[PDB]
Amino acid sequence: GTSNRDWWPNQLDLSILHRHSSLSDPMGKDFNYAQAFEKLDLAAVKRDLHALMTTSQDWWPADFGHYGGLFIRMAWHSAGTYRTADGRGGAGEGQQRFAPLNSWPDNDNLDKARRLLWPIKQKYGRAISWADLLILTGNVALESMGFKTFGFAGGRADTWEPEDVYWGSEKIWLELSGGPNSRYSGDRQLENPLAAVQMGLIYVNPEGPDGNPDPVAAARDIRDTFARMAMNDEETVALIAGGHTFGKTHGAGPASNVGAEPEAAGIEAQGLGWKSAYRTGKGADAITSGLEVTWTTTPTQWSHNFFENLFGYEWELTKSPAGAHQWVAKGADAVIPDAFDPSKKHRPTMLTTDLSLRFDPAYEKISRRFHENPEQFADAFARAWFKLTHRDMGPRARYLGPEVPAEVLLWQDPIPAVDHPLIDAADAAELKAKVLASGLTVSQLVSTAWAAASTFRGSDKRGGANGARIRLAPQKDWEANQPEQLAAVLETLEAIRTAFNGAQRGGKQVSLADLIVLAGCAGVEQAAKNAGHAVTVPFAPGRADASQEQTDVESMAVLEPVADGFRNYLKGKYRVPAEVLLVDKAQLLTLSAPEMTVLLGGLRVLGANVGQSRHGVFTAREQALTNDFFVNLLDMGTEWKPTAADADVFEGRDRATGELKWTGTRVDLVFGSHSQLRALAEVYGSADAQEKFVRDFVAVWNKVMNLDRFDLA
Amino acid sequence: GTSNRDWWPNQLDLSILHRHSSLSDPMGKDFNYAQAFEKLDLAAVKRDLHALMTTSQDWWPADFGHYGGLFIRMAWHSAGTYRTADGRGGAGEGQQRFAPLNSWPDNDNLDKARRLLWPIKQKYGRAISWADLLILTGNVALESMGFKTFGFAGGRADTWEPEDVYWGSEKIWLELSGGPNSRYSGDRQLENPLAAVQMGLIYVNPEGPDGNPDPVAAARDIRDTFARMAMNDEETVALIAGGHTFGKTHGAGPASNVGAEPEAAGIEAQGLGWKSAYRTGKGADAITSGLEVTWTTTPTQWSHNFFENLFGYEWELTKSPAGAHQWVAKGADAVIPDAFDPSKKHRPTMLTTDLSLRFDPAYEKISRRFHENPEQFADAFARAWFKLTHRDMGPRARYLGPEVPAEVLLWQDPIPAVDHPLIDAADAAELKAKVLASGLTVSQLVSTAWAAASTFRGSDKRGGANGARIRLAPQKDWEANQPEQLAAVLETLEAIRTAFNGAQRGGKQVSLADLIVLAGCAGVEQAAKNAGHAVTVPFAPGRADASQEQTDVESMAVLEPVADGFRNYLKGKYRVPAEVLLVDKAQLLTLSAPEMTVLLGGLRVLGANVGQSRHGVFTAREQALTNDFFVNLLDMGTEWKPTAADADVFEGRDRATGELKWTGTRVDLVFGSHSQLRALAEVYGSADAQEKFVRDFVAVWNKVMNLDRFDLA
């Protein structure tokens, strides 16, 4: 069946905004996972998980009689898809059970791991999501094997179809760099937003960069990809060495024995894949990565043996039985146990990427510190395992259950507790009137509140107006935020705040985070009033102000909007057309197409554009909340052409006289071009739609203001 | 961006069940189009449309100063995509404004037509849908030019994204037959469900079959495609000659002048396409099809001059200025007016397909009758135009407005009026108890009610339980319906009905259509009872019984289920895997993936399979409504393998002992294979799911029972 994608492969794809509908979700529209989880007997689940560890099934026998290593790898891959660039991937939606990740090469045989967990999933049902279960099982594996974890939070709700993620452009699994769709250019620069070296890998190639077994050059890829997963050098060394304290790799024979990945397998395989024709196909004969390495003398118990081995031998390059590059300890005795045969032992072995930890000079210093101080190693790994597995969960308000660590961590972008009474309706009316009396304009108030709130992304639930981090480094300096205008708005708001707070009795006070949002609401009200409409914009207080010391400036950089079609802003020239970037931003904001349409049309006439650009400002009454953008956009009296100077700017001229009426960008005109967007614009550009437009705009505005409000919702 | 479709291009696609979500719809959840339409001033809309016919815009000047012919074509293409095989296509969802239809080659310059209607669409807003407007404008065009129409119904709600339709497998627009993706095989057999001869055409090639200008062979393609659009010989001749009473074709110069279709055009084109570099690019210079034919001496007025010309001259094969084949009247005077230059006249011209109406001997008889009796011709055409533009609207209860024709037409599958009091809740309880006391089993009651209700298809809104047409030819004899078992059930239910109706006072009575549905409800209640669960299944009376004389048997044939995965039924061997056909049936029933999953699992254990096949009957308590299908399917203790005899049947054996536990088809096992369906099955197979399963099954059962109940809309 030929589809629209086949005929017009570069048209914009709006279906990413309408994923995750009530249609595809088997749970009722009222189902609340948090509530179901809070009633789970978590201790019972963990008892069943402990039992499972050593209950070997014949269809995938447990190495060393213990599945712990398999399950640690499973949890680590669940978490490992995360990219800091967009917040996409990670463990938080349980996506490992869906395409493509269920069938990525690096997820080979983790289908077996997941199937071993079905009986537990079945027994506890909706009260523990797969997403939570994959992480908790990893925790229990570590505990079962003697490692004390730093804690665990539940609350990852399951999802029901695959997430739309750009994982790269290659059309071949595992394609090496420099192909026609290379993710690399120049001096090994990985394209944003990617965070892995080859299509279908989690981070790096375990043989070395594009297969070349150089531990020093492998280290470079490790550092880069782990940084792109929000992990620094100490955390990276702790995780790799921590992980590889356990279990083993699987490469007992050639890879040509292994058949189709799960999404390609026959219907009879019942959701499993990588069926192997080598000997028994499993256990002692297992083939997963192709490498055959077992790191420690006690693969089912926490130990300090990884760094003893790493530093205590010299390493020789060799090949696994499948032909992969790996390393064996020069002159060592056979001290490593076999996974199935008590009469066999093996010499110590390492991956290229393990040797990175010794041969990269910066890693070597950390690795030695961990070798010499194993308690520091254990604490770093526990903290890093928690960060790994929680980094995409968002504010601590979302963390459920009785094992949540009390310690607040910088990477959680923490927001202080509110400890005082909040403002009430009367106070909010007072503050709005003071904001409007100050002289701040509709444009300034709307722009500032937009800038504060629209950093939120639903991918990892970072960002938003809570915290008032717009006043801090680095947000206060972002170009999209118009630093000098921003500074003037914040100054006036801060004086309003000070005065209001100084007049109160009791502990009552308003946060700047709340006042930024409320001032934006007053701007929207005033805009509606300018259009001759009475409107009330909802507002929920309770935001708090974070400090600069609670705001990691390097981690904040990934939230900078380099493209924001809602403010007609593009920081540079990008490979992707601007309308694609708009739909991407709408997705991170959790907006549907109709919400994206309404919001952008409104923002245009309110004066939210960066730099007060006239592009898309299709009204003669700026700062009035009207549907003018749609009515003027859709007017067939006007003809549009790209300009001389710039193909991405368009001039709209009267079709009869030739006179210039407007100018717009691609983000503006896509609403007049794309056949689904134009159908939306038509509704809001119709003669009966002014009230609809206002009321839809206010709703989506309030939606955006509340995106990070996990303390309420 | 590599997608799951790219990696696994043959995996089943569930996203067709989740279109049309509340997310993509700009109207509120409570918007009711019929309520908006009933307050439209339809007379005022028609006055605007009438004025528009002769108000020429310079960006697309009106031929002869009158847009009528353009709008008639626009409405005929809106309607002309309809296929009787699946009910997909037609005018009823306004799909011409979306991809792909908006950019089909046969819809060339209809973008102009639709744009001319924006100012009226804008004026009346949500009270008239684009879908309705397209058709109304065609009617008003005919009226304006002196043709009396048969009527008009409103009620086609707008849609907001493209419909998923199989339009063929060709990868090149207009590809001639016999390519690698040929829609033809054998002796010019067009593949079901297609209804056109080439990709991107409405019906046939106006030059002749694959461009060969032979009228006799063209007639064969006309007859075949029109039949596949539910039009017979009389209706086809009336429509083609009726249409071609008006307007003209456009081929003033070569087609290489014409640019990209709308979905490929630049953003500045603002949703228009086929921009032409030939001279002015429009009006007198217009290029649309490439043909340059004007059929009558008064292209803007109804006449009987198409047949006067057709029979009054001999025709010579010629070429248009673009090079297309077309026909000119041998030795005729220049009597046909020019579209822009009052001092020029042209000889009569015809398409190959026009001459079909004279040179195919069956067509010729009808055409002569219409020539000699033009009042017969006007009546046939009015009736056929109404059928053409309404054939996918569904039951007459959906028809809105003051111009709906009072005559009931056989092609409507008419349902008699109900003229007596309906049964009440106490009566329904009494009849359920009588049904259960008769000895009819859960399996019989469920099977029969399923058979009657599951003929519905949301594509053209035909079928469903209303009418009790399951008791009539041809439904009573369809294999899927198990004719001998059916007849026994219907006999017993008819005795129950007779006894209940005979005992009443006061005119109250129950129809057989209602009793068949109610009995099915009693079966599902009894199944729930057998499982230890008291539930009440909703039931809405008001169905009526249609007669054999009100049932067109030949038109009913397309509703026969030759594949019904809900009854594990496949009438023959198909190129398409059975799972794909299941998802296709789910789409026609308007089911989401969770609804399809719950319903199939339930039906299995209720005994709804055709022929009492054991395939998928994964329970040891058949006729009890339990989640056993999912629990047993998902049990890893069972291993599945295709059978020797049949690759499409699978044996489930105990993994340890080898003992045979079950058998199933592809339709069964897909729920344990496909990654998204298995996630659904897991919900209903969990230990906490019995109440959910029951409730969701009752909901979807009731939904299916009510699919055609537009009288309660």
Ligand code: HEM
């Ligand atoms: C540079 C980063 C890493 C590389 C290249 C990498 C590579 C691999 C490979 C190839 C395997 C063998 C798969 C098989 O054949 O069965 C594996 C196993 C595993 N890795 Fe990693 N790894 C990395 C980091 C991690 C991290 C961060 C963790 C956890 C904190 C982790 C924990 C595991 C464990 C427990 C296993 C053993 C699986 C079993 O016993 O079945 N590794 N690693």
Ligand code: HEM
């Ligand atoms: C065998 C069936 C049919 C064929 C092959 C056919 C073919 C065509 C073609 C090739 C054009 C010229 C497009 C252009 O160059 O502008 C056209 C025009 C037209 N057709 Fe048909 N047609 C068929 C049936 C119908 C029917 C069923 C109707 C309506 C009842 C219809 C109404 C018209 C009208 C009104 C125009 C004139 C458009 C104008 O004035 O701009 N045709 N036809």
Ligand code: NA
């Ligand atoms: Na994420």
Ligand code: NA
């Ligand atoms: Na249809």
